[PDB]
Each structure stands twice: as structure tokens, then as C-alpha cells.
Design an enzyme around this catalytic site. Structure first.
Site, short mmCIF file in Angstrom:
data_model
loop_
_atom_site.label_atom_id
_atom_site.label_comp_id
_atom_site.label_asym_id
_atom_site.label_seq_id
_atom_site.Cartn_x
_atom_site.Cartn_y
_atom_site.Cartn_z
N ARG A 141 6.38 -58.36 -52.02
CA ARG A 141 5.99 -57.87 -53.16
C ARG A 141 6.81 -58.68 -54.30
O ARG A 141 6.33 -58.25 -55.42
CB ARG A 141 6.32 -56.46 -53.17
CG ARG A 141 5.88 -55.57 -51.95
CD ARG A 141 4.14 -55.36 -52.37
NE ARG A 141 3.93 -54.68 -53.51
CZ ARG A 141 3.74 -54.95 -54.65
NH1 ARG A 141 3.71 -56.43 -54.94
NH2 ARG A 141 3.67 -54.18 -55.68
N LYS A 177 5.12 -50.65 -53.48
CA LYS A 177 4.47 -49.67 -52.79
C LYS A 177 5.42 -48.97 -51.53
O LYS A 177 5.89 -49.91 -50.82
CB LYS A 177 3.24 -50.07 -52.24
CG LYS A 177 2.38 -48.91 -51.38
CD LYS A 177 1.02 -49.54 -51.02
CE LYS A 177 0.36 -48.62 -49.92
NZ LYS A 177 -1.03 -48.58 -49.81
C1 LIG Z 1 9.61 -49.55 -44.15
N1 LIG Z 1 9.02 -50.70 -43.96
C2 LIG Z 1 9.04 -51.51 -42.69
C3 LIG Z 1 9.78 -51.31 -41.38
C4 LIG Z 1 9.85 -52.11 -40.20
C5 LIG Z 1 9.14 -53.09 -40.15
C6 LIG Z 1 8.13 -53.58 -41.49
C7 LIG Z 1 8.08 -52.69 -42.63
C8 LIG Z 1 6.95 -52.87 -43.88
O1 LIG Z 1 7.11 -52.36 -45.18
O2 LIG Z 1 5.97 -53.86 -43.41
C9 LIG Z 1 4.89 -54.15 -44.24
C10 LIG Z 1 5.05 -55.68 -44.42
O3 LIG Z 1 6.42 -56.07 -44.40
C11 LIG Z 1 4.17 -56.25 -43.16
N2 LIG Z 1 3.47 -57.51 -43.26
C12 LIG Z 1 2.44 -57.87 -43.94
N3 LIG Z 1 2.44 -59.16 -43.84
C13 LIG Z 1 3.23 -59.70 -42.93
C14 LIG Z 1 3.49 -60.92 -42.50
O4 LIG Z 1 2.78 -61.77 -42.73
N4 LIG Z 1 4.52 -60.93 -41.32
C15 LIG Z 1 5.36 -59.61 -41.01
N5 LIG Z 1 6.39 -59.90 -40.51
N6 LIG Z 1 4.90 -58.75 -41.85
C16 LIG Z 1 3.96 -58.41 -42.86
O5 LIG Z 1 3.21 -55.31 -42.83
C17 LIG Z 1 3.61 -54.03 -43.65
C18 LIG Z 1 2.12 -53.61 -44.67
O6 LIG Z 1 1.98 -53.75 -45.95
P1 LIG Z 1 0.95 -54.35 -46.98
O7 LIG Z 1 1.69 -54.68 -48.41
O8 LIG Z 1 0.57 -55.48 -46.09
O9 LIG Z 1 -0.16 -53.15 -47.10
P2 LIG Z 1 -1.11 -52.76 -46.01
O10 LIG Z 1 -1.30 -53.78 -45.04
O11 LIG Z 1 -2.56 -52.48 -46.63
O12 LIG Z 1 -0.81 -51.40 -45.22
P3 LIG Z 1 -0.56 -50.20 -46.24
O13 LIG Z 1 0.51 -49.59 -46.40
O14 LIG Z 1 -1.97 -49.65 -47.22
O15 LIG Z 1 -1.64 -49.46 -45.15
#
Ligand SMILES: CNc1ccccc1C(=O)O[C@H]1[C@@H](O)[C@H](n2cnc3c(=O)[nH]c(N)nc32)O[C@@H]1COP(=O)(O)OP(=O)(O)OP(=O)(O)O
Ligand SMILES: Nc1nc2c(ncn2[C@@H]2O[C@H](COP(=O)(O)OP(=O)(O)OP(O)(O)=S)[C@@H](O)[C@H]2O)c(=O)[nH]1
Ligand SMILES: C=C[C@@]1(C)CC(=O)[C@]2(O)[C@@]3(C)[C@@H](O)CCC(C)(C)[C@@H]3[C@H](O)[C@H](OC(C)=O)[C@@]2(C)O1
Ligand SMILES: [Cl-]
Ligand SMILES: [Mg+2]
Ligand SMILES: [Mg+2]
Ligand SMILES: [Mg+2]
Lengths: 189, 330, 189
Positions: A141, A177
Site C-alpha cells: 500500500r 485499509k
Molecule cells: C493483519 N494482516 C495480515 C496478517 C498475516 C498475514 C497477512 C495480512 C495481510 O494484511 O494480508 C493482505 C496482503 O498482505 C495480502 N497479499 C496481497 N497480495 C499478496 C502477495 O502477492 N503476497 C503475499 N504474501 N500477500 C499478498 O493479502 C491480503 C489482502 O489485501 P488486498 O489489499 O489484496 O485486498 P483484498 O484482496 O481485495 O482482500 P480485502 O480485505 O477486500 O478483501
């Protein structure tokens, strides 16, 4: 798979690429474009085999976004944090090097952060190595909202960098977010 | 055995014009390109009149009366869909007739003006006819900017060629790379006459110098270190006139010319002023120094003194190329 | 010799599927950093199994975003139903684990059918991926979908041979990209 307490994650993306990508009969349906990107991604990896970046780990490549991380080779203590910035510049030096020979103006956008993550593999089929942790979510982000040719660092990251010989500027507040609103900073050069 | 030739060069270098010859040479649609010809004619005249007053010193008409025709050409300048009323061709010609309008033409280098200027303007009487049908020369002369990449596929003696035309402009150069991989050779085009002009992109960079740094960029490319360049020094005709005319000395735009003496291997065309011979080879060697620096015999540079509008000169040179493509087993 | 050898290859007539743990952070704020990683790995473990059955092919796992594709490696003319099925499985699957997660979750599936360009980029830490405008649309389809439902393109429907009951997805109103390119979308019933 274990968990670290201080890993420096970085994201370097090329926003100008999604547009560059074209699927015309001339460019073999977007092959020639991916060819250029392949050069780029390759040119970036030729850094990981340099002595000064011997501690950087290329985690993966999402689209035209390079994902690295420093400090996974452990069990100053925050010097590997400055090396991630040394690397960020690295990618730039090389991204603009390519621009010379491609008659382009690709600009890199970075998002660096540091904190606890959870390294490890995932997926039964063909297990793939990846680090999790909120620390990673903010790093990404810190890029999607970054500015071209500017590295985006958080408060503490900002602080640690100053205590490393770095000057910073406050971008202002930004909504991450899940974590709400956070004050970010741009690394000066 | 099929080939892929990529024409490269700055803007209005003459890439599009050379691909035309290839159709003329190795390949009733004109009714469509008539429009483009009238648009050139229009831009040509309105550009000249527009520079009349802006130039320093200003250019005054020889006919105070023509001042009303000037107002016309301007009032319609920005006009979207011009109908080219029978009046246009009159005021237009009237102005081309004006001595001051031409006075300003002899300084057309001090402002951006298309090349088919004098050519088309000298035939308003023809283009205005409703039965007007463009000759093959009027197409080689028409001027349209190229945006993107277009592939012309022709054949010669049961051998295939795939011509590639791209935008010479700067913002266009980014699309070039998409043709770099797997290309027989490069046809680099140079506006040998545009030595006393600046590019449209910034109105400061010398058109020739731009063509040089561009050539240096290609020759010393990390992806063209083995691809050979067939340098086309074009617009020799426009060059010679400028050289003989002598209004703008070369050693005033390129000082290194003063210390230059004509070559040894110089093979001047039948009945060619030594002044011209000297000049054209200067421009060629300028490019040769770029290609002599590096390359390390991994790729070579074959210059040519071409004239894209002359289907006769292009037929000739394109053969000296086809030879190289075979002789070098490229 | 001039450009690095690229390990890519065009592949026409293939269906692409994307999935997302709708409201991942909504649950990521109650589960231990680890419980999420186990849950996530738990999930995709099951997915990958489902994947190999339905003749699909997991391409890469990005956090909560899972995406595979059918039509590869070897071209199967049935590339349409495979992803639809896959989408079907991922729907029930997430619901089963939605219990163990003890939190409100659901998958948002998106499916498009077109041609791609698959392979690997750069030269380090290789990871099989796919690229094409069609690949972009499929992602955007997922993005502009509905919980529990499988969003598809008119292109994906012309490959199902009227074997599925569908309804107007009206994706144009949910995702901008779909709107911009006026893409007729539908939802499996
Ligand atoms: C408190 N957060 C966490 C605690 C343990 C492990 C992960 C997290 C976490 O914040 O994971 C997010 C990214 O790091 C993680 N993520 C995204 N891309 C990658 C990626 O390429 N690699 C890894 N390891 N993680 C990723 O997945 C999550 C999804 O966020 P998105 O910004 O992609 O929104 P969304 O997919 O539409 O879900 P949303 O809340 O509407 O429904
Ligand atoms: N007098 C003369 N005019 C020429 C010659 N070669 C080209 N031209 C004229 O130059 C003008 C520009 O030529 P063109 O072929 O359009 O340039 P280009 O390289 O294709 O430029 P672009 O289209 O990428 S921006 C045309 O009006 C053409 O008639 C030449 O050798 N002599
Ligand atoms: C690399 C080029 C291009 C245009 C091609 C493409 O199909 C993508 O790589 C996908 C869709 C595609 O490869 C599937 C994964 C993911 C992660 C969804 C990519 C990103 O959204 C890319 O955009 C970004 C933001 O890099 C995108 C859209 O970029
Ligand atoms: Cl030029
Ligand atoms: Mg052109
Ligand atoms: Mg989600
Ligand atoms: Mg996601």
C-alpha cells in the site's frame, strides 16, 4: 515456516507499463512487450548477485512489480533496512538505463516498510516461498499510493533512516485499509 | 527467404516516403488521398503567411492588397472541415504569387514548414480541379505523420521482404523496440538537407544533430550490436540546392565543416558541383564517425546518398541493399 | 543472443479464473497473524487438489487472491467448464473452512475466456505466470463480481454451450474497467 521480527519488505512497480502493453499483430500480440519487461526483470535480478545486495531476497514478481525483502537471513540491527533503500536506488539506476536503449521513460515507484512477517511456503501442488504479515500489506500500500521516483516510508521507517544518514519529507496522511489512516514520508535524495 | 527491414530516423526523415516507392516499385485508391493533398496545400500556405509577421525582421507583402487574402487564409486556418471553396485556391495562389510571401518562404527554416510546400503550391491550378487525379509523384510528395507501426509486405524475384515503418517523432520512438528482436537490417533515414532547421518537438534541437544522436543511439544499442545499418542519406536534392544557393553556410551550423576537405574515395555523380560533393560527403562522414567508433566488426554501416521522391534513385539503391542482404548472408 | 531468451508462449482458447477471500482484512483483524496463514494455507491446500481434478492449473497464490486457468498445459477444448467447475468447488470449499475460521468469509470468482501468453520472467526465483489483456479482464471480472457467485464474460459463455443457467452480471456497474470496455457480464446460477 518461522516468523521474523524485523524484515524489510520493498515493492518497486512500473505504473507506466500497463499502458505500454499492447496486443497488436505487429508486436506478436503483446509478446514483444513482455520481451522488454523480461529484459527489465532480468536486469533487476543481476543486482541480487552483487556483494552489497547479498542480503536481498527477490520474493516474487506481481505483474510488473518487483517484490524483495531484507533481513530474512537472520534468526546495526536495522542496517539491512538501509540496504533495502540502497537497492531501491539500484533498480532505478537500471530502470533508467533501459530507458536509454528503449527510447522510453519508465519511472519506478517504491514502497518500503519493515517489521514482523511470517516467511514460509504455501500451496500443496508446487509449494512456493512467500512472506506474510501486516508489515507486507502496508509495504504494498506504500507503493500503490507512492509517487514516481520516490520511495515511501512510514514514520518509524522514516526515523530509522534518519539515524542512518537520510533526510525525509512528510507526504501527508494516507489510508491503509485495515490500519486506518497513517502518516507517510518520502525519502529525499 | 523472408526478411524484416526496419526503417528508423527522426521525423519527416522520409521513412513513409520510402515505403511508398516499395509499393510503386514492387507492389484507383487515390480518390481518398486527394484530401490529404489539399490539406498539405492549406497548411503550407497558412504556415508561411503566419510566419510572415512573427519573423525577425518581419516580412511585408509586396502587395498591400493581398492583406485581405492574408486575413482569409487565417480566418480559415483553424477551421475543422474545410470545403476548399473555389475562392481558397485563388487567394492561396494570389499569395504564392506575392513576392513577400515567397520572401518569407526562403526563410521557412526559421519556422516549421512541410517539404512539399513549394511542390504542391506550384500546382494549385491542378489540385483545385474536380477531376483532379493525383499522379504517382503527388503521393510520394503528400505528407502525413505516422503514428504506430505498420508492416508492408512485398516480394522481389520470389524473395519476401517485410518493410516496417514507425513514427520518427520522439514520443513515437518508444514503440521501436517492439520490432528490434529479429530484424534482418536497419534502414536508417537522414534528412541530409535539414541541417539548417530545428525539430518540431522542441524548436531548438538541430534536425541533423537530432538525426545524429538518434543514429548514435541505434548504432550503440545493446540490442543492435550485430544488426547492420543501411544508412540512407536522403533529400540530397534539397541539400544541393541549399549548398549552391549558399544562403545559409554549413560551417555556420556545423563549424567543423570549415576544416573539412573533400574525400579520396569520393565518387561524385555525373556533373556535380564540387561544393555539393564536398557537402554531402561531410554529412556522410559525420555519420561514419559514429559507426567507426564502436561496433567491433560485429555489424557494419552501409551509407547511401538517396532521394526518396525519385522512384528512379530508390529503385537503384534498394538493389544495392538487396545485394548487401545476400552478399553478407544477413 | 541480443535479448535474453524469453521462456514464454502464446496459448489461444483458454479460460482464466480468479478468486478472492472477500473481506479478508475484516477477518484479518480477529485472527492471530498465524491462524490466518494456516487458514489461508489450509484453504489453498484444498483448492490445489480441486484444481488438478477439474483439469485446472494453479498459476500463483497472492495472499487471498488465488488464480488458475484451464486450457493448459496441453490444450483441452473443454477449457470452459473446467474453470466453471473450479469456481464451483472454490465456493463450497471456502464455506467449509469458513466454519473453522469462525468468521464471515466468502469467495468472489471471476472468469474470462480468451488467449494468453504464459511462461516466466527475469531469470531469478522464477514463477510461472500468465499475461494478456484477456488475463487482465479475468482479474477485473473477479474484482467486479459478487460473493458466492461466479462472474463470467460473454466470451466465457460462448464456450459453455448453453450448459449453465445464467443471469445479467451487470459488471459494468460494479467495476470501472468492465464499464469502460462495455463488457457484457453474467453470473452462474
Ligand atoms: C493483519 N494482516 C495480515 C496478517 C498475516 C498475514 C497477512 C495480512 C495481510 O494484511 O494480508 C493482505 C496482503 O498482505 C495480502 N497479499 C496481497 N497480495 C499478496 C502477495 O502477492 N503476497 C503475499 N504474501 N500477500 C499478498 O493479502 C491480503 C489482502 O489485501 P488486498 O489489499 O489484496 O485486498 P483484498 O484482496 O481485495 O482482500 P480485502 O480485505 O477486500 O478483501
Ligand atoms: N524534395 C524532397 N522531399 C522529400 C524527399 N524525401 C522525402 N520527402 C518529402 O518529405 C516529407 C516527409 O516525408 P515522410 O516520408 O512523411 O517522413 P517520415 O519519416 O515518414 O516521418 P513520420 O511520418 O514518421 S513523422 C514528405 O512530404 C515527402 O514528400 C526527398 O528526397 N526530396
Ligand atoms: C504485465 C503486464 C500486464 C499489462 C499484463 C497482465 O495480464 C497482468 O500482469 C496481470 C493481470 C496477470 O499477469 C495476472 C496477475 C496480476 C497480478 C493480476 C497481473 C497484474 O494486474 C498486472 O498489472 C500490474 C498492476 O502490474 C497486469 C494487468 O499487467
Ligand atoms: Cl532527419
Ligand atoms: Mg512515417
Ligand atoms: Mg478478498
Ligand atoms: Mg488479493
Amino acid at each position: 515456516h518461522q516468523s521474523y521480527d524485523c524484515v524489510c519488505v520493498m515493492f518497486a512497480s512500473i505504473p507506466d507499463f500497463k499502458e505500454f502493453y499492447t496486443e497488436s499483430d505487429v508486436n506478436k500480440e503483446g509478446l514483444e512487450c513482455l520481451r522488454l519487461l523480461n529484459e527489465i526483470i532480468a536486469d533487476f535480478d543481476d543486482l541480487l548477485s552483487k556483494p552489497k545486495f547479498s542480503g536481498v531476497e527477490k520474493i516474487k514478481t506481481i505483474g510488473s512489480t518487483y517484490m524483495a525483502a531484507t533481513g530474512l537471513s537472520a534468526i546495526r540491527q536495522y542496517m539491512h533496512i538501509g540496504t533495502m533503500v540502497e537497492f531501491a536506488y539500484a533498480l532505478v539506476g537500471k530502470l533508467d538505463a533501459i530507458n536509454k536503449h528503449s527510447f522510453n521513460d519508465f519511472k519506478l515507484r517504491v514502497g518500503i516498510n519493515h517489521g514482523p512477517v511470517i516467511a514460509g511456503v504455501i500451496g500443496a501442488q508446487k509449494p512456493q516461498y512467500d512472506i506474510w504479515g501486516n508489515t507486507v500489506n502496508v509495504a504494498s500500500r506504500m507503493d500503490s499510493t507512492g509517487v514516481l521516483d520516490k520511495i515511501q516510508v512510514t514514520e518509524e521507517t522514516s526515523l530509522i533512516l534518519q539515524t542512518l544518514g537520510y533526510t525525509c519529507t512528510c507526504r501527508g496522511i494516507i489510508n491503509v485499509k485495515g490500519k486506518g489512516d497513517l502518516k507517510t514520508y518520502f525519502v529525499n535524495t | 527467404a523472408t526478411h524484416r527491414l526496419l526503417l528508423l530516423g527522426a521525423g519527416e526523415s522520409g521513412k513513409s516516403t520510402i515505403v511508398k516507392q516499395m509499393r510503386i516499385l514492387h507492389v484507383g485508391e487515390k480518390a481518398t488521398k486527394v484530401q490529404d493533398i489539399k490539406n498539405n496545400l492549406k497548411e503550407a500556405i497558412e504556415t508561411i503567411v503566419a510566419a510572415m509577421s512573427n519573423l525577425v525582421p518581419p516580412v511585408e507583402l509586396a502587395n498591400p492588397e493581398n492583406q485581405f487574402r492574408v486575413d482569409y487564409i487565417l480566418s480559415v486556418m483553424n477551421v475543422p472541415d474545410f470545403d476548399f471553396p473555389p475562392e481558397f485556391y485563388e487567394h492561396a495562389k494570389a499569395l504564392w504569387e506575392d513576392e513577400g510571401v515567397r520572401a518569407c518562404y526562403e526563410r521557412s527554416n526559421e519556422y516549421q514548414l512541410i517539404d512539399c510546400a513549394q511542390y504542391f503550391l506550384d500546382k494549385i491550378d491542378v489540385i483545385k480541379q474536380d477531376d483532379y487525379v493525383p499522379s504517382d509523384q503527388d503521393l510520394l510528395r503528400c505528407r502525413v505523420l505516422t503514428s504506430g507501426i505498420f508492416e508492408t509486405k512485398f516480394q522481389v524475384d520470389k524473395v519476401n521482404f517485410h518493410m516496417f515503418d514507425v513514427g520518427g517523432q520522439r514520443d513515437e520512438r518508444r514503440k521501436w523496440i517492439q520490432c528490434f528482436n529479429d530484424v534482418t537490417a536497419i534502414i536508417f533515414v537522414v534528412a541530409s538537407s535539414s541541417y539548417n532547421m530545428v525539430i518540431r518537438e522542441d524548436n531548438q534541437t538541430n534536425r541533423l544533430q537530432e538525426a545524429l544522436n538518434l543514429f548514435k543511439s541505434i548504432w550503440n544499442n545493446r540490442w543492435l550490436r550485430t544488426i547492420s545499418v543501411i544508412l540512407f542519406l536522403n533529400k540530397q536534392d534539397l541539400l544541393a540546392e541549399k549548398v549552391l544557393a549558399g544562403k545559409s553556410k554549413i560551417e555556420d551550423y556545423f563549424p567543423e565543416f570549415a576544416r573539412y576537405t573533400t574525400p579520396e574515395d569520393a565518387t561524385p555523380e555525373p556533373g556535380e558541383d564540387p561544393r555539393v560533393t564536398r557537402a554531402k560527403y561531410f554529412i556522410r562522414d559525420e555519420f561514419l564517425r559514429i559507426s567507426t567508433a564502436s561496433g567491433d566488426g560485429r555489424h557494419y554501416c552501409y551509407p547511401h546518398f538517396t532521394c526518396a521522391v525519385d522512384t528512379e534513385n530508390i529503385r537503384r539503391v534498394f538493389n544495392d541493399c538487396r545485394d548487401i542482404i545476400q552478399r553478407m548472408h544477413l | 543472443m541480443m535479448f535474453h531468451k524469453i521462456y514464454i508462449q502464446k496459448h489461444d482458447n483458454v479460460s482464466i479464473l480468479f478468486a478472492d477471500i472477500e473481506g479478508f482484512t475484516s477477518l484479518a483483524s480477529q485472527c492471530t497473524a498465524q491462524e490466518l496463514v494456516m487458514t489461508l494455507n489450509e484453504l489453498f491446500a484444498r483448492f490445489d487438489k480441486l484444481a488438478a481434478e477439474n483439469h485446472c492449473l494453479r498459476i500463483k497464490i497472492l495472499g487471498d487472491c488465488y488464480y488458475c486457468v484451464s486450457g493448459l498445459p496441453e490444450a483441452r477444448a473443454d477449457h470452459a467448464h473446467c474453470c466453471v467447475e473450479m469456481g464451483m468447488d472454490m465456493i463450497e470449499a471456502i464455506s467449509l473452512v469458513r466454519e473453522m475460521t469462525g468468521v464471515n468469509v466468502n469467495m468472489r470468482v471471476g472468469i474470462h475466456s480468451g488467449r494468453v501468453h504464459c511462461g516466466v520472467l527475469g531469470l531469478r526465483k522464477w514463477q510461472f505466470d500468465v499475461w494478456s489483456n484477456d488475463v487482465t479482464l479475468a482479474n477485473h471480472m473477479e474484482a467486479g463480481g459478487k460473493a458466492g457467485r461466479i462472474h463470467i464474460t460473454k466470451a466465457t459463455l460462448s464456450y459453455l454451450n448453453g450448459d449453465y443457467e445464467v443471469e445479467p452480471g451487470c459488471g459494468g456497474e460494479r467495476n470501472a474497467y468492465l464499464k469502460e470496455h462495455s463488457i457484457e457480464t453474467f453470473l452462474i446460477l
